[PDB]
Design a protein around this ligand. Structure first.
Ligand SMILES: [Mg+2]
Lengths: 1340, 91, 603
């Protein structure tokens, strides 16, 4: 069972694995984001609502006047899309906000509001997203590609190796806020630990600690453990729990209770300590000398002196022990020490500290931050203060606090947006542990860390920027609050927010023209993610690592599709099912593998929570019961793969193709091609310019439906009904009633566009595909876009192709064609270039669009119209004129050669001069349409009036149909009311149905109903008039102009560029090539059956480029066509349907057990015929990416044709009619027409302009530029004694102005001879160094 | 906006305050702080208006040259130089 | 404003200048006020920083960013980098009388000429055409000529024809590696838009025909035409300057042709009969009365100028294959047959070319090479050397070797997991066993493929070199690596790791069968690796060759014989084991100072 629009041409699908989940809606990313950006909801938590409830409420400078926010609403599109597309305006809306100013009663906060004063305030014009996830900025259609960046939080960097080359590994830890200032801690080659702020100079972290108002003793407390002494009779029995004595040698016999356990000079074992805990020792003998190195815990005062017998962190000495122990404070504290269990790195940092207090600590903070300034305590205070805890300059998004407490393994997801002293200490502790050897680092590209942005996010960010600006302003405004003389608007400047928004959209490197020449590329240019621009690395900052692929990329990012060249992996794309976690993280559908069942339940999992599990690959069977029919199954847990038990696993993939992006999910027989060739394939596929007709590729991938319907160029019903009035210009469906709303029973009117320009000058049009009267269901395709076909994507044309060498005409990559395809013109493509001529006003007076032009041959002038606008259909070429637009003269530009004539004729002669819109040299073609734009209230001319009358007549038509359709039900009910009570036969029809309430019907409540529904009729009439004249006003009227202009005209050239030796064509398999020569039909190799073969590729292609996929495709395609010659023949000779359906069903059986399971006995036997005629051209075949069609089925189908199972057959030359030994391979293969056309590349330059700062001939092709002649060439020339060549090359043809003039003369008068001269730009350098005082000279 | 401008701005304001210190009553205007404040304020706005309309003049000179070499002109940009060169001129 | 078309630049120099001059006057003015010297100090500082930023921005703390967050340009920035005067306009410079386009083949061309579209041809010579017209009187003034050339008054073409008669042109590709990246030609005019190309030279240009773009310039002075003529013509550049190798190597498809020609079938039509002239060979081939690759006795002759210049000829009877003779009719004079009796893969034709050039001179060689390309293309065409799903034979015992390999590895792994060996050496054993199975299946396939000729010879059968188009290429050496095949049929072993480690389990599959997801994923990673390395490699090679060319840049043969009898005693190199360069090479073409003795003394 299928969509009734699917039954129109059903494609056979090989493929053994069923699916449990459909493909989701592709563009869902942009939709969800931008939706989430403008959504009035509780708490907001996001978008406008967030920034509003953040910045607002807001008040005076404690001046007891407050500015509070309540609510908001998005205004409206004043127009719709196509309207803007016409004019060139930004599709947008305003933002209506609810505010209130509330001043306070005098000398009391809670003191009554001086005035509750609110108002609705205008602010900003946010653009809006089409239903296809794009934008309209200035007519044009940009797209916002989403970024991906390093999530905010904290990270543990390793930096192995090259640190000091000592072999030791350094470390560092970095905290990054969403917005704010980062922070770093790190090491020196000497185990010294340091802070660094804003990647500025390095400072001892001790300084930070001091800033925390921290006694250095409290620092020591934080990090190290405790060690306790008591002064004995002698030998200082220290407290001990035996554990810490794991890993030490006995310089003295470890003893307790007298019974020694360790001998003098014995390294204690762990098991010793074990039996020692069994002995439970606490106090131990100590050679006091052994205590020389144990630094003091902290300070130590005396009592009689009352003075510090020791300061915090003093190096312990024996006499020092005397002083200490003398004073009887037997409780002595020092610190635990170790090297491979507790490295004592804090102590030395303390040593190096030059600081004493919190205050001088802040002083250092300042000095390092702002240099050289003699500080005031308060300066540094405020600096550090707002540096890390004030929302003015720092924030962690919720995802921040999340990741933060997460990496810290703590158990809270919530928190603040700002830090805490704790947090920093926690960082330092963790890093110290890492330094000891407990704890592991992170790596960069591990997707568990890289988060993803969207449009709504960066949107609200720029929004915050603008809001902060107007915040500063209006805050200072409320500062001068003139009480009660101010509504909450007068203080409000609503310009700059809109300014910033418009900037962002119209200008941000995360915004570019929608790549628009394919329903494919249009969708590739949205499901694309990068790490460039603000918050990403730089195209030449590119580090190797990020530019690679991380095994975590599984099913989250296409492995194979990225635009190669100067950047790889940076502009990689997104896979099929991959969603986005609410935090901008990725997830992936996954099925539960319960006790023995791979059930049908599914979830979505991150890049890290995933790591705990083992998950089954796709291509492995189960017994319809989840039990892998095998036992050791291919699985994966973490950067790994292995055979696993029948019950180790936890999950399974959803479907094979969930590994790749859609831009590859098509190129069939993928698992028979290398990745490189697959890469070139997908990329060169992305640029298949749409040609004239549209034929499907015969071999597909079963995944071309969900491309179209999710693309835009289609046209799809919104509810079932009946096609009622088709036309090549528009579609009229009567909706069905149960799918209809009370008011406006209505008719779905689809206004397909005709030929309009794509962003790269390629036609588009939405041609219908339906039959008048046919029904459609709720959501079927109605009209097709470029390179589309009945809902099938169709990017090229499939062709009978042969594989063999031929007179070198396929030597390197020459593709060789016959006339017979360009005979059919099946590779022609139209092109559309918009040309524009405006009318502003310079000084000296404004300008005109007259047909009145000086010093031009009237021959040309004739071609224009009376206005000055050439007509529709004039085949035009370059060096001509399309509009006449003339300017006043001006003075400094008056040559004597016209001073003459202006003297004679009277100065009414040289007052004006031409600016006409020409035809850009190098182009030709035909005019299709001309748009003319003028200021309204300013005069509108002939053409303007014509466009007016046409468009209004048109727009009236549909609503005319509307009323005349919806009304007639009223006369239905009317006569239904007159029927009962003497129905009249010919009064109701031979007379106007309006002429029913003039005939006297027996006047009871039924005539009351007559007059009732008559008034209702007339009311609906008049309000229909209201609607239509609203439309008339809106359309008839002109259009505002960016003031400074008067009126502008746009003209639409068009050209049909067909094909030529030089163009670039390629199959989806990265097998590109230029068509070299096109011989006559008679010379193409022909089979015995007469039929010649279109193109003859090269055989050498496969060995080097190990991409078998092409050949297998070709064989399958020959097979697929091999159903045509069967059905077509069976049908041409007439035939009853029985055998037809029979052969159909058979051909559809044709394979191993697949998901297809179609049946044709279903049909009412006519649609059978429809299907057959769809087939008549050939049979369409489907094969998913990794659920393919093995060789055996291909041999099979081939037999079901009539062909030799090899696929090879014998052929004859067409120039000697003799047989080809070694039978060759022909089949049917999809070829695409790559849009690098030669006529865009050829370019010459006899001589033209020159740059002015240096008279070198200008560059580029738009300019008549000369080629680039390089230093490499300079050498390649010096290798030969090619002297005069090089000289005359680089002076006489480049810069020697005198010289080049002399040359030009001598050559155009028959004398090849050169005057050397001396370069010019050299003199430029000479004077350029003369600029600086370095006097340069040129000795005799 | 611009560090480079800001340097010259402050230069202006400083000289302005220098010369204007000459005359400052005490019996009235019991504060010199705001005096110098608004003095420099005005100096700044003077400087900035000068520079704005200078670069405006640059735009104006530009837009009056479309006759460079051959066909194939541009429409998008020119309108924007124009529209700025108009906006600034509004003042 | 430059205003020189396109977007407009800002020539920001003045700005600095402006602001610079600004401060200067301020200084005076403030000195003119008797300013508090602290602030006069400040203004002195401002001036100093200003002139600084004018001379070379950035050498201070904060380089004065221009705008949009960009640093501006001092007097020094016009000077340095790959955009300062030197590396931008003093050395590299766009030049007039030039053109650029896409390229194609056009095999009908002989060696010394290039195709050329009509249009570019027309513009590139406008001055010449004007001169010719006005010499002819067909026009009278330059304006008349401009108009005539505009709308192609149909005379023009023949005019242009005369102008081209021998006027050279110079062709080049973009990344100019070496002395042959740029050459000369004599064009033939095409009513097309692209450039044909004598399909041999495409090697020097390192050029695929997949959308390359070549550039073309034109000499003006007669002297220039001469320079090009004698010194950069394709008829003058045949021995790679890196090494006396002939650099005109018939590349790949001529190769397949020739190989398919010089060969032998076990028993073909009329094999082994006797003939008396390669004329008859041709006939009996085309007449379809004799097969091509078939043993046959044929009478021939051959020449040699071994004597004093005189190429004495002399006959004999050989037993060879037909196409051997068919070709042999082309081999020019001074060559012995045994040069050809072989099966003639690629390097054979290379060395043949070389000796031909060495003994014969130049013109014989070029004519030879041209004829060779012709014949090869023709016979490859006749061949029908296709390829299809049956060109890939399969090791039947693939599954065998693989099943036993995995059976063992399961054992050794459960041995370790039982705690009987170390993980590192267990990994090593796995490495080695997969290497073993790899090489074994390689032998299996390659051998099975390379010999499956089993065809009676009026008797039982014999087994000679088989004829798989794939195998035919390989043994031809025309295109493709034996390892390429290995990947096609054999499992392509194991791949790398982002580190450079190797995955434990290998790629068990071929390309015939399809890869499963994971293996394919891994291959993906490796390919991306290699590509990024391609990028960086091109990069570094750039700056390398830059320094290289720059370091010599001046060494020129100034004289003949420095008057000395020293030098170095060269010897073959021995890596300890096998030797690498026979002494024959270091000596070949390097003038000896001292003479040489025999090992026997005084000899
Ligand atoms: Mg190339």
């Amino acid at each position: 069972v299928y969509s009734y629009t699917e039954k129109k041409r059903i494609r056979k699908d090989f493929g053994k694995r069923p699916q449990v989940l459909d493909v989701p809606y592709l563009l869902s990313i942009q939709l969800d984001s931008f939706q989430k950006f403008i959504e009035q909801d509780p708490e907001g938590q996001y978008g406008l609502e967030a920034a509003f409830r953040s910045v607002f409420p807001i008040q005076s400078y404690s001046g007891n006047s407050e500015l509070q926010y309540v609510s908001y609403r998005l205004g409206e599109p004043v127009f719709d899309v196509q309207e803007c597309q016409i004019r060139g305006v930004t599709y947008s809306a305003p933002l209506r906000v609810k505010l209130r100013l509330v001043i306070y009663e005098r000398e009391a906060p809670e003191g009554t509001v001086k005035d509750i004063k609110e108002q609705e305030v205008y602010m900003g014009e946010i653009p809006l997203m089409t239903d296809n996830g794009t934008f309209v900025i200035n007519g044009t259609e940009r797209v916002i590609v989403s970024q991906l960046h390093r999530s905010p939080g904290v990270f543990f960097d390793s930096d192995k190796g090259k640190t000091h080359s000592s072999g030791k590994v350094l470390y560092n830890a970095r905290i990054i806020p969403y917005r704010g200032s980062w922070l770093d801690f790190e090491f020196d080659p000497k185990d010294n630990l340091f802070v660094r702020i804003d990647r500025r100079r390095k400072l001892p972290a001790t300084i930070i600690l001091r800033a925390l108002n921290y006694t250095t003793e409290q620092i020591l407390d934080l990090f190290f453990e405790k060690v306790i002494f008591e002064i004995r009779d002698n030998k200082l029995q220290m407290e001990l729990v035996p554990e810490r004595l794991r890993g030490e040698t006995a310089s003295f016999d470890i003893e307790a209770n007298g019974k020694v356990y360790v001998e003098k000079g014995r390294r204690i074992t762990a098991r010793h300590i074990r039996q020692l805990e069994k002995d439970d020792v606490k106090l131990i003998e100590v050679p006091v000398e052994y205590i020389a190195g144990k630094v003091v815990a902290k300070d130590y005062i005396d009592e009689s002196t009352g003075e510090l017998i020791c300061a915090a962190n003093m190096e312990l000495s024996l006499d020092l022990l005397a002083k200490l122990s003398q004073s009887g404070h037997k409780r002595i504290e020092t610190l635990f020490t170790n090297d491979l269990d507790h490295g004592p790195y804090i102590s030395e940092t303390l040593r190096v500290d030059p600081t004493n207090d919190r205050l001088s600590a802040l002083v250092e903070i300042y000095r390092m931050m702002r240099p050289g300034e003699p500080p005031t305590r308060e300066a540094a205070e405020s600096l550090f203060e707002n540096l890390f805890f004030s929302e003015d300059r720092y924030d962690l998004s919720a995802v921040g606090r999340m990741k933060f407490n997460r990496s810290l393994l703590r158990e809270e997801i919530e928190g603040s947006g700002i830090l805490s002293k704790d947090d920093i200490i926690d960082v330092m502790k963790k890093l110290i542990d890492i330094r000891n050897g407990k704890g592991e680092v992170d790596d960069i590209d591990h997707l568990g860390n890289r988060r993803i942005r969207s449009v709504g996010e960066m949107a609200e960010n720029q929004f915050r920027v603008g809001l902060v600006r107007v915040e500063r302003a209006v805050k200072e405004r409320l500062s001068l609050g003139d009480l009660d003389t101010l509504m909450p608007q007068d203080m409000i400047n609503a310009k700059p927010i809109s300014a910033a928004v418009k900037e962002f959209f119209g200008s941000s490197q995360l915004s570019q023209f929608m790549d628009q020449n394919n329903p494919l590329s249009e969708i590739t240019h949205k499901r694309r993610i990068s790490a460039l621009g603000p918050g990403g690395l730089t195209r030449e900052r590119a580090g190797f690592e990020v530019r690679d692929v991380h095994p975590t990329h599984y099913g989250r990012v296409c492995p194979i599709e990225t635009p190669e060249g100067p950047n790889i992996g940076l502009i990689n794309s997104l896979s099929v099912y991959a969603q986005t976690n609410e935090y901008g993280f990725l997830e992936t559908p996954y099925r539960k593998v319960t006790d023995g069942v791979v059930t049908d339940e599914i979830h979505y999992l991150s890049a890290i929570e995933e790591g705990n599990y083992v998950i089954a690959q796709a291509n492995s069977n189960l017994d319809e019961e989840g039990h892998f029919v095998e036992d050791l199954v291919t699985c994966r847990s973490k950067g790994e793969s292995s055979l696993f038990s029948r019950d180790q696993v936890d999950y399974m993939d959803v479907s094979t193709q969930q590994v790749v992006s859609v831009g590859a999910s098509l190129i069939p027989f993928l698992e028979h091609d290398d990745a490189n060739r697959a890469l070139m394939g997908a990329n060169m596929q992305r640029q298949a310019v749409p040609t004239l007709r549209a034929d499907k590729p015969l071999v597909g991938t079963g995944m071309e439906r969900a491309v179209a319907v999710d693309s835009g160029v289609t046209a799809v019903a919104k509810r079932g009904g009946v096609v009622q009035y088709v036309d090549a210009s528009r579609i009229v469906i009567k909706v069905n009633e149960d799918e209809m709303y009370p008011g406006e029973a209505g008719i779905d009117i689809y206004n397909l566009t005709k030929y309009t320009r794509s962003n790269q000058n390629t036609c588009i049009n939405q041609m219908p595909c339906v039959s008048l009267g046919e029904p459609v269901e709720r959501g079927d395709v109605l009209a097709d876009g470029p390179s589309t076909d009945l809902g099938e994507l169709a990017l090229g044309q499939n062709m009978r192709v042969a594989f063999m060498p031929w007179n070198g005409y396929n030597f390197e990559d020459s593709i060789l064609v016959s006339e017979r395809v360009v005979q059919e013109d099946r590779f022609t493509t139209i092109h559309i270039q918009e040309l524009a001529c405006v009318s502003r006003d310079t000084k000296l007076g404004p300008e005109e669009i007259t047909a009145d032009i000086p010093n031009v041959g009237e021959a040309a002038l004739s071609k224009l119209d009376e206005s000055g606008i050439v007509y529709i259909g004039a085949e035009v070429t370059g060096g001509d004129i399309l509009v006449g637009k003339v300017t006043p003269k001006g003075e400094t530009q008056l040559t004597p050669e016209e001073k003459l004539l202006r003297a004679i004729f009277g100065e009414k002669a040289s007052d004006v001069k031409d600016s006409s819109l020409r035809v850009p040299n190098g182009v030709s073609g035909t005019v299709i349409d001309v748009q003319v734009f003028t200021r309204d209230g300013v005069e509108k001319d002939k053409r303007a009036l014509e466009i007016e009358e046409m468009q209004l007549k048109q727009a009236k038509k549909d609503l005319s149909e509307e009323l005349q359709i919806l009304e007639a039900g009223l006369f239905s009910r009317i006569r239904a009311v007159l029927v009962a009570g003497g129905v009249e036969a010919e009064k109701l029809d031979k007379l106007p149905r309006d002429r029913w309430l003039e005939l006297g019907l027996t006047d009871e409540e039924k005539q009351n109903q007559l007059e009732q529904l008559a008034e209702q009729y007339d009311e609906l009439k008049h309000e229909f008039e209201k609607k239509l004249e609203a439309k008339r006003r809106k359309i008839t009227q002109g259009d505002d102009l960016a003031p400074g202009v008067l009126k502008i005209v746009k003209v639409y050239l068009a050209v049909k560029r067909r094909i030529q030796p030089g163009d670039k064509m390629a199959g989806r398999h990265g097998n590109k090539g230029v068509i070299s020569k096109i011989n006559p039909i008679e010379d193409m190799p022909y089979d015995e059956n007469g039929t010649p073969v279109d193109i003859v590729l090269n055989p050498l292609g496969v060995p080097s480029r190990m991409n078998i996929g092409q050949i297998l495709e070709t064989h399958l395609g020959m097979a697929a066509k091999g159903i045509g010659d069967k059905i077509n023949a069976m049908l041409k000779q007439q035939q009853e349907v029985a055998k037809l359906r029979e052969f159909i069903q058979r051909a559809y059986d044709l394979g191993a057990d697949v998901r297809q399971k179609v049946d044709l006995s279903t049909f009412s036997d006519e649609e059978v015929m429809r299907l057959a005629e769809n087939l008549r051209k050939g049979m369409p075949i489907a094969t998913p990416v990794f659920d393919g069609a093995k060789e055996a089925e291909i041999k099979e189908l081939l037999k079901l044709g009539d062909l030799p199972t090899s696929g090879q057959i014998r052929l004859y030359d067409g120039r000697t009619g003799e047989q080809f030994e070694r039978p060759v391979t022909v089949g049917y293969m999809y070829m695409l027409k790559l849009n690098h056309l030669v006529d865009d590349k050829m370019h010459a330059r006899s001589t033209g302009s020159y740059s002015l700062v240096t008279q070198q001939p200008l560059g580029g092709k738009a300019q008549f530029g000369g080629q680039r002649f390089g230093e490499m060439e300079v050498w390649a020339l010096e290798a030969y004694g090619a002297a005069y060549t090089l000289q005359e090359m680089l002076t006489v043809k480049s810069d020697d102005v005198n010289g080049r003039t002399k040359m030009y003369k001598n050559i155009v008068d028959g004398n090849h001879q050169m005057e050397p001269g001396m370069p010019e730009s050299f003199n430029v350098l000479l004077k350029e160094i003369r600029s600086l005082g370095i006097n340069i000279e040129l000795e005799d | 906006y611009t560090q480079s401008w800001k340097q010259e701005m402050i230069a202006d304001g400083i000289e302005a305050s220098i010369k204007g210190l000459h005359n400052f009553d005490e019996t009235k205007y019991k504060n010199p702080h705001a005096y110098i404040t608004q003095a420099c304020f005005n100096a700044f706005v003077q400087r900035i208006k000068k520079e704005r309309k200078e670069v405006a003049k640059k735009y104006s000179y530009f837009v009056h040259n479309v006759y460079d070499s051959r066909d194939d002109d541009m429409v998008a940009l020119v309108d924007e130089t124009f529209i700025q060169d108009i906006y600034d001129k509004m003042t | 404003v430059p205003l020189d078309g396109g977007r407009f630049a800002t020539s920001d120099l003045n700005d600095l200048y402006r602001r610079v001059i600004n401060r200067n006057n301020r200084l005076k003015r403030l000195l003119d006020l008797a300013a508090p010297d602290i602030i006069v100090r400040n203004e002195k500082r401002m001036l100093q920083e200003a002139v600084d930023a004018l001379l070379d921005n950035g050498r201070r703390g904060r380089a004065i960013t221009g705008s949009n967050k960009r640093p501006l340009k001092s007097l020094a920035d016009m000077i340095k980098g790959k955009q300062g005067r030197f590396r931008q306009n003093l050395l590299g410079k766009r030049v007039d009388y030039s053109g650029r386009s896409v390229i194609t083949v056009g095999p009908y061309l002989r060696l010394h000429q290039c195709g050329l579209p009509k249009k570019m041809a027309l513009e590139l010579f406008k001055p010449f055409i004007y001169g010719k017209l006005e010499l002819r009187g067909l026009a009278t003034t330059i304006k008349a000529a401009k108009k005539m050339v505009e709308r192609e008054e149909a005379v023009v073409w023949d005019i242009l024809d005369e102008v081209i008669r021998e006027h050279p042109v110079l062709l080049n590709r973009a990344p100019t590696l070496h002395r042959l990246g740029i050459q000369a030609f004599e064009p033939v005019l095409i009513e097309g838009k692209a450039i044909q190309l004598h399909p041999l030279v495409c090697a020097a240009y390192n050029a695929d025909f997949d959308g390359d773009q070549m550039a073309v310039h034109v000499p003006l002075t007669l002297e220039a035409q001469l320079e090009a003529r004698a010194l950069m013509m394709s008829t003058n550049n045949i021995l790679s300057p890196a090494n006396g190798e002939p650099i005109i190597v018939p590349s790949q498809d001529v190769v397949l042709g020739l190989y398919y020609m010089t060969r032998d079938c076990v028993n073909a039509k009329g094999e082994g009969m006797v003939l008396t002239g390669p004329k008859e060979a041709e006939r009996l081939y085309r007449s379809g009365l004799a097969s091509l690759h078939a043993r046959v006795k044929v009478r021939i002759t051959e020449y040699e100028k071994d004597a004093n210049g005189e190429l004495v000829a002399k006959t004999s009877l050989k037993d060879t294959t037909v196409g051997r003779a068919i070709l042999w009719m082309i081999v020019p004079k001074g060559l012995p047959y045994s040069i050809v009796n072989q099966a003639l893969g690629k390097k054979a034709i290379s060395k043949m070319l070389n000796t031909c050039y060495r003994i014969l001179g130049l013109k014989p060689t070029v004519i030879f090479a041209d004829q060779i390309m012709y014949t090869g293309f023709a016979y490859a065409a006749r061949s029908g050397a296709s390829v299809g799903i049956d060109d890939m034979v399969i090791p039947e015992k693939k599954h065998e070797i693989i099943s036993e390999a995995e059976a063992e590895v399961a054992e050794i792994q459960e041995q370790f997991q039982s705690g009987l060996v170390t993980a590192g050496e267990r990994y090593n054993k796995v490495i080695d066993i997969w290497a073993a199975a790899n090489d074994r299946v390689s032998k299996a396939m390659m051998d099975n493929l390379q010999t499956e000729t089993v065809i009676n010879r009026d008797g039982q059968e014999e087994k000679q070199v088989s004829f798989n188009s794939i195998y035919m290429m390989a043994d031809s050496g025309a295109r493709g690596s034996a390892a390429q095949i290995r990947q096609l049929a054999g499992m392509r072993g194991l791949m790398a790791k982002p580190d450079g480690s190797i995955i434990e389990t290998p790629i068990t599959a071929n390309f015939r069968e399809g890869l499963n997801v994971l293996q394919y994923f891994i291959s993906t990673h490796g390919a991306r690796k290699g590509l990024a390395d391609t990028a960086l490699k091109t990069a570094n090679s750039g700056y390398l060759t830059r320094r290289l060319v720059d370091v010599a840049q001046d060494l020129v043969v100034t004289e003949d014989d420095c008057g000395t009898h020293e030098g170095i005693m060269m010897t073959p190199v021995i890596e300890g084991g096998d030797v690498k360069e026979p002494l024959r090479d270091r000596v070949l073409g390097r003038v000896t100072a001292e003479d040489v003795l025999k090992p026997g003394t005084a000899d």
